[PDB]
Structures are given as C-alpha cells and as structure tokens.
Amino acid sequence: HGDFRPRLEPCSCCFRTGAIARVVDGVEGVRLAVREEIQKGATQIKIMASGGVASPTDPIANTQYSEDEIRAIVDEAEAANTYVMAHAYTGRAIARAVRCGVRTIEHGNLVDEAAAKLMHEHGAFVVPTLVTYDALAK
Amino acid sequence: TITVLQGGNVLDLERGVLLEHHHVVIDGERIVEVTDRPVDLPNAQAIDVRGKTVMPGFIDCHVHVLASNANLGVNATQPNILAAIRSLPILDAMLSRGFTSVRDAGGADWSLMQAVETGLVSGPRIFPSGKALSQTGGHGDFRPRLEPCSCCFRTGAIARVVDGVEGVRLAVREEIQKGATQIKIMASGGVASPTDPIANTQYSEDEIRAIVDEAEAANTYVMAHAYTGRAIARAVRCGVRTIEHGNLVDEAAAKLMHEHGAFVVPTLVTYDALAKHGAEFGMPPESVAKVASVQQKGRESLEIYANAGVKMGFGSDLLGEMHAFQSGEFRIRAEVLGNLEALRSATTVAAEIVNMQGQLGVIAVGAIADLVVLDGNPLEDIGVVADEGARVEYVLQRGTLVKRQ
Amino acid sequence: TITVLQGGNVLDLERGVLLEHHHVVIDGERIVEVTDRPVDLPNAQAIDVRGKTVMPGFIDCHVHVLASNANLGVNATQPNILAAIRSLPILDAMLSRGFTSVRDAGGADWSLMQAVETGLVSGPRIFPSGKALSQTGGHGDFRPRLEPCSCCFRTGAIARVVDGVEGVRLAVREEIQKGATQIKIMASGGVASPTDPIANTQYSEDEIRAIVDEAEAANTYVMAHAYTGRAIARAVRCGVRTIEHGNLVDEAAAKLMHEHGAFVVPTLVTYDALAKHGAEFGMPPESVAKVASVQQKGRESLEIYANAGVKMGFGSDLLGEMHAFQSGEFRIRAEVLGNLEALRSATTVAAEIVNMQGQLGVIAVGAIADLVVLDGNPLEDIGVVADEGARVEYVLQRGTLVKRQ
Amino acid sequence: TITVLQGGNVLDLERGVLLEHHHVVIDGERIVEVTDRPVDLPNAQAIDVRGKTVMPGFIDCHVHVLASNANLGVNATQPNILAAIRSLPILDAMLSRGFTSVRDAGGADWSLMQAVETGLVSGPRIFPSGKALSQTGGHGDFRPRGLEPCSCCFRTGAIARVVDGVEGVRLAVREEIQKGATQIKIMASGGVASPTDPIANTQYSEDEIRAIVDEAEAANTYVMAHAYTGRAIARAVRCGVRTIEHGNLVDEAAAKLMHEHGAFVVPTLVTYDALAKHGAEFGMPPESVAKVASVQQKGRESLEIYANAGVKMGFGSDLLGEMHAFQSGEFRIRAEVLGNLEALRSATTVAAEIVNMQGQLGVIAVGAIADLVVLDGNPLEDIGVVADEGARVEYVLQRGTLVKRQ
Numbered sequence A: 001h002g003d004f005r006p007r008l009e010p011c012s013c014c015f016r017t018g019a020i021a022r023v024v025d026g027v028e029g030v031r032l033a034v035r036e037e038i039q040k041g042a043t044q045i046k047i048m049a050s051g052g053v054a055s056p057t058d059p060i061a062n063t064q065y066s067e068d069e070i071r072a073i074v075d076e077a078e079a080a081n082t083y084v085m086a087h088a089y090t091g092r093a094i095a096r097a098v099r100c101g102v103r104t105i106e107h108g109n110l111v112d113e114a115a116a117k118l119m120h121e122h123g124a125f126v127v128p129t130l131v132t133y134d135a136l137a138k
Numbered sequence B, C: 001t002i003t004v005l006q007g008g009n010v011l012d013l014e015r016g017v018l019l020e021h022h023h024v025v026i027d028g029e030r031i032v033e034v035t036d037r038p039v040d041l042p043n044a045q046a047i048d049v050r051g052k053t054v055m056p057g058f059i060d061c062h063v064h065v066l067a068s069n070a071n072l073g074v075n076a077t078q079p080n081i082l083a084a085i086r087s088l089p090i091l092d093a094m095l096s097r098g099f100t101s102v103r104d105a106g107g108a109d110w111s112l113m114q115a116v117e118t119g120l121v122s123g124p125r126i127f128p129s130g131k132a133l134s135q136t137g138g139h140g141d142f143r144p145r146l147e148p149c150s151c152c153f154r155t156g157a158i159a160r161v162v163d164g165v166e167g168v169r170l171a172v173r174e175e176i177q178k179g180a181t182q183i184k185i186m187a188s189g190g191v192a193s194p195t196d197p198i199a200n201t202q203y204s205e206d207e208i209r210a211i212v213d214e215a216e217a218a219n220t221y222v223m224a225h226a227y228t229g230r231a232i233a234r235a236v237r238c239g240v241r242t243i244e245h246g247n248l249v250d251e252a253a254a255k256l257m258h259e260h261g262a263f264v265v266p267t268l269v270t271y272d273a274l275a276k277h278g279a280e281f282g283m284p285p286e287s288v289a290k291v292a293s294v295q296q297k298g299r300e301s302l303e304i305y306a307n308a309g310v311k312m313g314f315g316s317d318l319l320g321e322m323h324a325f326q327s328g329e330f331r332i333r334a335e336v337l338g339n340l341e342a343l344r345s346a347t348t349v350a351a352e353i354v355n356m357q358g359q360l361g362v363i364a365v366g367a368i369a370d371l372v373v374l375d376g377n378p379l380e381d382i383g384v385v386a387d388e389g390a391r392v393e394y395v396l397q398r399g400t401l402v403k404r405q
Numbered sequence D: 001t002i003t004v005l006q007g008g009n010v011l012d013l014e015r016g017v018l019l020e021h022h023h024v025v026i027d028g029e030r031i032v033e034v035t036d037r038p039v040d041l042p043n044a045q046a047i048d049v050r051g052k053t054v055m056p057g058f059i060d061c062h063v064h065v066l067a068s069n070a071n072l073g074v075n076a077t078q079p080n081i082l083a084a085i086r087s088l089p090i091l092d093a094m095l096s097r098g099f100t101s102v103r104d105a106g107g108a109d110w111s112l113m114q115a116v117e118t119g120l121v122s123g124p125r126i127f128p129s130g131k132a133l134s135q136t137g138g139h140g141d142f143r144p145r146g147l148e149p150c151s152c153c154f155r156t157g158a159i160a161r162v163v164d165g166v167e168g169v170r171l172a173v174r175e176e177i178q179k180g181a182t183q184i185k186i187m188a189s190g191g192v193a194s195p196t197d198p199i200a201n202t203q204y205s206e207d208e209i210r211a212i213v214d215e216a217e218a219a220n221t222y223v224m225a226h227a228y229t230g231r232a233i234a235r236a237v238r239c240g241v242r243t244i245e246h247g248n249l250v251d252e253a254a255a256k257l258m259h260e261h262g263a264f265v266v267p268t269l270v271t272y273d274a275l276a277k278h279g280a281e282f283g284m285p286p287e288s289v290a291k292v293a294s295v296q297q298k299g300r301e302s303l304e305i306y307a308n309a310g311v312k313m314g315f316g317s318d319l320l321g322e323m324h325a326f327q328s329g330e331f332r333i334r335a336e337v338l339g340n341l342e343a344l345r346s347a348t349t350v351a352a353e354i355v356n357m358q359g360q361l362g363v364i365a366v367g368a369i370a371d372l373v374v375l376d377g378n379p380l381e382d383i384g385v386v387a388d389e390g391a392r393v394e395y396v397l398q399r400g401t402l403v404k405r406q
C-alpha cells in the first residue's frame, strides 16, 4: 500500500521528505527499519497490513506482510515501549494483524463481527476514517 | 449488438453428450441463451453451424509462449525485442488451434497479457506466471557446469534464480506487483536444464512455504514443477495447488494429492516431441539424455492419477518449432482415459485450475463467449481436435469471431 | 529467378528526367538491366508498369522507429515487450509509404535490423544508431528538474546518459559492439526534453572529438543533433559528418559545413505536426513552448543551406501517432527548393549519407532492387509522393515485392 | 489591471539625480510609463508617494539564504525540514529591507526559487547556485582534521558539495544546471568559515576551473568564484570566471587583469564586521575567528583599488545566522569609501548586470520589471535612509504587486 511504483524496480537510496511510506521486506529488514525509525524519534510505528485505495498495484482484499514480519515489528516497537498501528480493511486482514499484536487498526471498513470480537478481546483500538471516502467520492 | 450460432450440436461436458440443433446466443462478450428454440433474431449476426459441434474454447494450463527455441539457455540470451517478436507467431497458431486461453508457465508477463486483451496482438487470453522461481543450480538455472549472476530481466528468460526465504518472499511480491496471476516454482530437477538430475528435490520446505504464503496473500496460488513422488509429496504438503508434469508419481503421493485437493497438469506431448526432434532442434545433448526416462511412466502416471481421483488439466509445454504438436496431447490422453476426459481436461477442469469456474470452459448462460466450432464429433473421434488444427473452422473469443477456417 | 517491371517511366535523378517505357530487370536482389529494349522474357515475373513512375525506394535519414508515443520520457518507461510490439505498425506503415530504408536516430538496435532482414518483421531496412548519446541534463536526459540514475537499457529509450571523455569512449565502443551502423549524439538543447533550452550547447569539444574518433575507428561517422549556428560550428569542427535539424544556422556555419563536407538533415514536418497536436498528444506543456521558435527559421534555413552548397538529406523525426505525416516533408521541401531537390534528398543524397553510394537511391545496373512504383509524375506534382502513401502502388525491397496497393 | 505610484521622486541612476514629482505606471508586472504627464486612468490602483524616493528594488549578489546558523558545519547537519523552515524568516526579512532579488551563493535550490515565484513563501526572487563546488579539504569541506569518510545524499542545509577532478566537476556542473541553478559557484581559494584551509592558498587546478567555466558557458551562464588573494584571483580570471566573491586581498595587478577581462567583484565587507563583534559568540569555531582578523583590514582598502582599475562592483553581504540583520549596513560601508551614488549603483544597475538582467531589473525604465522600493528620504544625500535595517522603507513592490507596507 506504500509502494507507489507503477506496474521495473530497483528503488531509492534515501528519504524524500514528501514520502508517506518506505518499502522494506523481510524479518531482518523490518526489524532494522523499526529500530531506525525509533532512533529518528518516531513515537509509534505504522505498517500497511492490507491493500488500499491510494496505491497503484494492490487490490484491497489481499493481505500484506507475513506474520513473522509483523510479529518482529510489534516486538521492536514494544522493545521501545510503544506500539504498532496498522492499515487494514477486511476482517481477514484485521484478524491476523491483531493476533500478531498490533494495538490500533486503521480504517477497518470491512470488518465482520468475528474480527470485531477478537479486537475487543485483545483490547485493540480502531480508527475509522470515513470522511476521506466521501471526499474522494466527490 | 448481438450474435447467434444457430443449429449447432452444443457439447455439454458434465453430462457427456452433444445437444443437437441447439442455438447459442451471444450478447457483448457473454453467453445469454442456449436453447433449441426457433430463436428470435432481429439484428443478430447469424453464423450457421448446422451439423457441427460447438464447444467451449480450449484452455492450456502449461505453455511457454516465449520459448521460441528449444535451447532455453540460448532462448534467454536472445535480444529482448527479438524475443518478443518471435512469440507473435506462437500466439497466433495456438489461437487458431482452438486455444482461447493459456496459463503461461514462465516467460510471459502482464504486458503480453495486455497486448492480447486490448487487441494489439492476436492470441489466447494469457494468465502469466511472470518468471518461474528457481533455486540455484535448479531447473531454471541455465548456467553451464564460475558464475557471478545477473541483475536484469531478459524478456526471453523462462525463470529467475532466487534463494532463501526472504529472497523468495521478495521475488513473489515483485512478480505479483508486475502483475502475475499465479506463481510458478521449480520444486525438482528436470530435463531442459544443464546441471540437475531429475530425481533431486529443489528448494527447502521453508522456501516453498514462504512462496505459498505470499501467493495466498495476493489471493492466488503456486504451480510447481515436479517429477518424482517424493518431490511431489513435499510440494503438496507445503501447499502448492497445481503440480506440473508429475510423470513419476507413486500412488501414495497421488492419494495425498487427492486429499489436499491439488491438481496435476501433465505434459506428455512434449516428451514425444523431444524424443523425435530432441538433439535435432538444438537442445543440448545431455538434456536429451534425461528425456528417455520420464516418458516411460508418462502414460502410466495418467492411470494412477485417475485411480486416486486427482483432477487433471491439459498442458503442452512445447518449445520452439515443436510448438506445432500442441493439439496431439488430446489424442495421448484420449488413448488412456476416455476422450470425454481428454476434452474435460482442457475445459471444465482447466477453467477450475485458473479459477474461472463458470466463466470459461462451459457453454452456459452468463459464461464468457469463448467458443470453438468443430467439424465433426470429438466425443467419438478425438482426431477432430487432435490433428494439428485441421477441423476447427470457427473460433470465437469474448463474443467476437477471431478465426474463420 | 528473375523479375521485370515493364514499360515504366524510370526516374533518373542526376539528369532530372523521366525515361519513358524503360523496362527494369531484377535478378535476385540486384538490378541487372535498365533499357527501352523489347526485353527477352522467358520465366520472369512481369509486372506491368505502363504510364507509371518507377523510382528508387525512399530513404528517411532521421526516424525514431520506437517512438510509439510523443512523450519520449514515458516512452522510455513503457515495458520492453510492449515498446517492441508498438513499433511494428510504425515500421509497416513507413514501408507502405515507400520508404525502403531508414536511418534510426536512437532507439532501434541490431536486433530490429535483423528482424526485417530475415523477414521476421515487415518494414524498411534499418541503419541503427543504437542509443543516442547524451550528457547529463542534455537532450536525451528525461529526468524532471535530484536524480538517482539507472543501469539497464529499456528498449523504449531513445538515449543513454554518459559524461566524460572516457565515458563516451566506452559508450561508443559498446554501441558499435552491439552493432550500431553510426553514432548519434546530442550536441545542443532541444525541444522534446525537459531541462535544456534550445540555445545552449552540449558535450565538451574533448568529448565530441573522442566520440568522432571512436566512430571513425570503426569506419563509420557521427550524426549530431544541433540547432544554432554556434552549436553546429563546433560539432563540425570536431568532425561530425551529419547534422540533424539545424534549424538555426547562420551562413558562417553553413559555409564551414560546406567546407568540411558535412551534410544536413532538416526535419521540418515534425514542427508543423507538433504545432497542431503538440500538447494534444501528450508531450509536456513546456516542450511545446519550445516548438514555436524553431519552425520559423525552419523553411528559411533550407535556403541558407542551398546557398552555401550543403548537401541535404530527408528526415521526418516524427513521434507517436504523428508518424502518419511522414511523406509531408516532401511537400515542405518542394515548396522551397524544386521538387527535383526534394526527391534528391530522399534518394541520391540520402544514400550518400548512409554510405551506400551506388548501392541504394539510384536505378542503375548493379544496384539493390529497392523500387517504388508511383501513380503519377513527382517531378511535376510533388503530391504523388507527399500524400501519406496515396499514390504508391508497388514497393519492391531487395528484389522481392512487399507492397501491392 | 494596473497600478500607479504618483508624485514620487524617481531615482535615475546613470545620471545620478532624483526626478521629482514623476509618476510611475505599472501594468501587470512591467513598468509602462515614467512621466509627470498627469495620468488619466480611474481603473488603476494607486499609491500616493509624495515627497518620497522611489527607486528600483535592491539586488544582493552574495547571500546564503539557508545559512540559519553561523557554524556552516552544523548548518549542514541540521535535519532537512528544519533547515527549510528556518530560512523563511531570513527571506521575509531580506524582502522587508528592500531586497527584491538575491543571488544565493550555495544552499538555495530551484525549489526555493519556485516557492517565492508562485508566492508560496514571502521573499526576494532567488538566483540559486544550487551547491557551491569545493575540492577536498576546500572552503566547502567542513570535515575536521581527522578521517575521510562519508557522504551519500544532499542535505538541504549544506552550502557546498565536495567534488574533485576534471570529469568530476564537469558532471557536477551538469547536475547542478539540470537541477536548475542559474549560475555556478566554486571555491577557488582558502576562506574564513571552513576548518582546514588557510586563506593564503589556492583551490582547484586550472584544468578543473576551466572545465567548470566551459560547462557553465555551454548552459549560457557564468561561474562566480570565491577568492581572497591576488594570486588566487588572477588565475580564476585567467580561467574565465566572470565574478569574484570577496576579493579582499587584491593587488592592482589582479585588479587590472580583472578590468581587462570584464570580470566583476562582489565585496562582502559587512560580514567581517559582524564576525568581528559576534564571531565566537554566535557559535562559529574558535580558529575561524582567528582568520577573520586579517581580511577586514585590507577590505575597505580594496574597494579603492577596484575603483581605480575600473572593475565593476556589486553589492554583497554574506551574513550567517542571526547576523543576518546587519544586511543593509553594507550600503554605509561602501558609501563611506566611494560615493553613495556608487553604493546605490552596486545594488541596482551593476547588480542587475551581474545577474544578466540588464534592463530587466535595477532600473526604473519603460519595459522593465516592477521591482520597486519606496523610500522616506533621499539616499543620494543620506545613505542612512537605506542602511538602517528596514527603518525608512515603507513600500516594497515585487513584479507589479505590493508586498510590504511599513
């Protein structure tokens, strides 16, 4: 959901201040990236854990990151006494993310009650963002 | 507007009969009516299909559209534009043979699939794998027996070499970003590659599992090249959906396959072709050495699969000028299982493999209008489909008529 | 075997007259006889050409065969196999307009050349430049106004970016290894690039001299893109042999060009097309700001060149769907210099540019059978050529007949 | 629409006289009339400038807009988005003092230029250099005497980049021009604000400099060059650099050579006074303030040498950090040696020539761009009406529109 490359590859050495996301894969890759972000003084960690609307190549129904990666990220955030926030639409995408230990779910427009129940139980929060969809409608 | 195939004998595959003098009505790209009514045609393109079999367009679940010559090593090193050009005839010939859809097993990309869909290029609908994943020294590694590798994708390479869990994870995420519809791996040694004996397994289980997971994360599946029962069993246990070739199964592995709900796509016709014109068409001499063994159990494997109840899809896997023999696989399969089965393999079972059950491989209301009009009855003579081409005189694709023969 | 175009009016260009009812005799790929003899036809393919002009195939000295859309930036970034596919119509159309040879000004390679020569693909013989050389921020640099840089050659890319004496030396050596027939460089600001104003020069004299040398070492020459008299003069003084566009010469630069024996290839049609459909066909707004100025002196320059006695070749340089207007350059030139000269630019002078003196661009004994058959006389009505292919009904290429219209 | 400054005393600079009660009529972004012919347009938008001097807006030929603190080492290492933010008050303040154009001498890029031109940000028009070119250990190289690691990407707070070698510089110039520099800045000498280079010695080979000049000329611009001594100056000019920065230690030999080649100078005397008082105080390293003692001596003196050899002089300040406030003081310093006509010429007619905008800026004439300052008093007799930190300028107009009311 953060990869804005159109449908060749090798990206990009260094960070543009206009960039929302960075692209990192792999357990050691994410682990580092979280440590880098916390060093640079983030207060919490955002990940994309499902497809979205604003990115070119990902349909919304599919999931992002392995459970190993997400678990590594949640651990590195907890290690710095903070939490992970996670962008995620479907109940399938939410449920996994929550059980990997993420604390807040962003958007969450397509929950079933099963995933909702799991959220409540784990004590995870949701941050709906309904207004953006009406604006992107018009 | 709107089209009617009138007076045909519509092949219904789940009941296993022709339905004579049934009309089929196409609106846009979809089939709207199948009936033996006198039908109410005002502004319909009538095409008269009296006493000729009309069946769903064929689906081939294992092609390499870009294999324009039998030495895959030298196929990879041909210049890009030239690799692309040489695939254009291959795509045309397939379509004229009745094949309105193909699953490409490494080579074709999303661009090629777009080129047929926008109509820039004549061919079957492509379901591209992107590039097959291969471990180092694997069935996709075409380096001879020193190697530093190679940081740019040649458009005529069938495969790419990637090792390790994060390596393969990233490669799948790449391939799906570039727009693969499914993921191909090499889970065993093969024939067309320099260094791997056929009995050996490829990729650890951690690698395969990682790959399967990334495919499922993008709501698709992994197809896996595998010969022996050992190489098949572990691939299926890791979660691969379709097995390619599969010539050396035991019934143990077939039972496991059936239990997991895994498909096979045998490609027997490629071994018969590689037998006759192997070293002749420029495939390296020690690769034709390996081709002797797999074709033996080839027909025998078909029986094991049917006995275990494992669904079987149609596949050629022909390379280079041997691409002509594509339709002969129908015969090969009809000789072992009934020619009802042979036709089912390329239609209903196929459509399921590519997740288009109800969309392709069946003449029914709501389905896509990918039709073949056939001079004769395939249900009694398999030769009407299995003769290089010959006896197919209409090919319809997504509503429109693309071949008149 | 053997072919006769009988009873045509053969255009002889150095005398400037039609030769009525002269038969032309083709054996293999070569012209064997040109005569008004009743000719001794036993087994020849007679094609009747009574009352129709037969002239050499046209040679366009500046095309971009791969420029399939007007934004050369986005052209570069389109997928490889698509870039290749999309050039096929472009090549086909050029030929059917009567162009049997093109010199490609960056984009096309040896593989494309081969595709047409082996007859895998329809179109003109190509004299490929490989990739246009361009300094950073130069006319072939398509990055917008803090830049990371790439390392693999996209097949839609017109240019590559190389700087430094050694860098350009290596680049020339590389291009010729890959099979370039001549070397293209950008020696000045242009129109189709984002960051360079047209008035300024590109590459040091050191870099250009090195490039020319590496060219000459492979017994070929350099073609140079250049507008103003200042940018031109220094390129000629470094020893570049052809000068592309050249819209803003003064007579001091023209005189020098004459003195050194340097050609020009103006490309006037492309500015008229970019005038009408510039921002309309997807070329960036600040590039069409730059197209206003160069077309002004465009026609005027031809007179300057003619006056100082500088040999002029035919060039279109059209991009994207504007490729159709190719023949229109005949009109534009015929309106300023006679339509003799206009025809000379695409035949006798053109062949000299590509070093095929006596091989192409002349109907004579021993020359290559690249013929156009024309319904009308171009020596009086230039429109019989300059009408997008309307009045050309036969195109012969290396002996064989390729267009019947 | 249309604007009139009415009844102003229009400074004409080539004659050196006020023209009292002349009206100046702006249409769009251009000046269309300077006259005393009563103007008849009610549709206009008018501003009463009775008994007030209206002159062209000032141009400063040497600033570092991004130098938000006096330690250029630590300026380079500040986070990007902060580096940007902190330059906004600097820009806004320069504009209020009457500077409507500035030539940035490394730091500011094309993005900043755009930000003011599209009006996203308040400040003078910028003529960006991008980044100053410097050799290793050069006036641009802020690495301590170690060492030799490091550096990947361009920090937006960095004044310079280090590049060495003929091809290296050639490529760097092309890069800088592609990124949208209007001219090229190089260090051709030791300096004051860098750790390792004593001011006496020269920087860059003649091959390097001459390659730099060529690439700049190929892009129809010029090279500006930082140099102190007559030795360092002469060779720079021999290699074809068009303007020389600072130049505090000329001999009349170099000056004469400068006049001959048509090369300009931009002294920046004010910065050395500021670094004298508040040098080590505002956080510039203790051995950089050791170097500042010497250059200010010959500073005032050099002005006379330049005048004598007839070498054109442009206004420059080159202030760092909070010392940015002293910008206008450079007028008084220059007035005290050469006439205050000359002081005003340096920031107008001469400056606009330096930035190749002769006739476009620095002159109130028909067809020129409407960059105007309205001044309470007459600078031709009291230089303090300009040299007193924004005190006596109550109107600033930029490309037609009014941007400061004070």
Ligand SMILES: [Zn+2]
Pocket: A052, A087, A106, A107
């Ligand atoms: Zn989000």
Ligand SMILES: [Zn+2]
Pocket: B190, B225, B244
């Ligand atoms: Zn295979």
Ligand SMILES: [Zn+2]
Pocket: B062, B063, B064, B105, B317
């Ligand atoms: Zn295969």
Ligand SMILES: [Zn+2]
Pocket: C190, C225, C244
């Ligand atoms: Zn050009």
Ligand SMILES: [Zn+2]
Pocket: C062, C063, C064, C105, C317
């Ligand atoms: Zn061109």
Ligand SMILES: [Zn+2]
Pocket: D191, D226, D245, D246
């Ligand atoms: Zn300086």
Ligand SMILES: [Zn+2]
Pocket: D064, D105, D318
């Ligand atoms: Zn400075």
